[PDB]
């Protein structure tokens, strides 16, 4: 029931637009994150 609790409305009135980007550093395990399409760290 992970997806069940995943659904959430934004409570903060003052914020900038976020996009559901996918986080794939080196492990390959993707994560949906609301962020200002790929994530990389040296």
């Amino acid at each position: 029931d992970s997806s069940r609790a995943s659904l959430t409305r934004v409570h903060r009135q003052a914020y900038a637009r976020l996009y559901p980007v996918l986080l794939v550093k080196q492990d390959g395990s993707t994560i949906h994150i609301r962020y200002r399409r790929m994530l990389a760290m040296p």
Partner: protein, 85 residues
């Protein structure tokens, strides 16, 4: 500022849709919470019945069976990933 999209105008059929969605969501969440309540009650009563039977069977075991353990203190759980690594 708020000059990005000052205009926010939507139709009526979308409002009807929204209302239906919220009603369905309310029902769904009520049902889901009911499932949660059922399972936790079942687990709790299972714990209770097992413990009571243990009391009857052995007066020695329950003493250690209710005892706390230190190893629980630094517990970490790994969250589910959308893709396997």
């Amino acid at each position: 500022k708020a000059r990005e999209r000052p205009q926010v105008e939507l139709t009526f059929e979308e409002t009807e849709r929204r209302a239906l969605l919220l009603k369905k969501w309310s029902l769904y969440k009520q049902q889901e919470r009911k499932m949660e309540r059922d399972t936790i009650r079942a687990m709790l009563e299972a714990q209770q019945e097992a413990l009571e039977e243990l009391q009857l069977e052995s007066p020695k075991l329950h003493a250690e069976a209710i005892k706390r353990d230190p190893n629980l203190f630094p517990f970490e759980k790994e969250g589910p990933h959308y893709t396997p690594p």
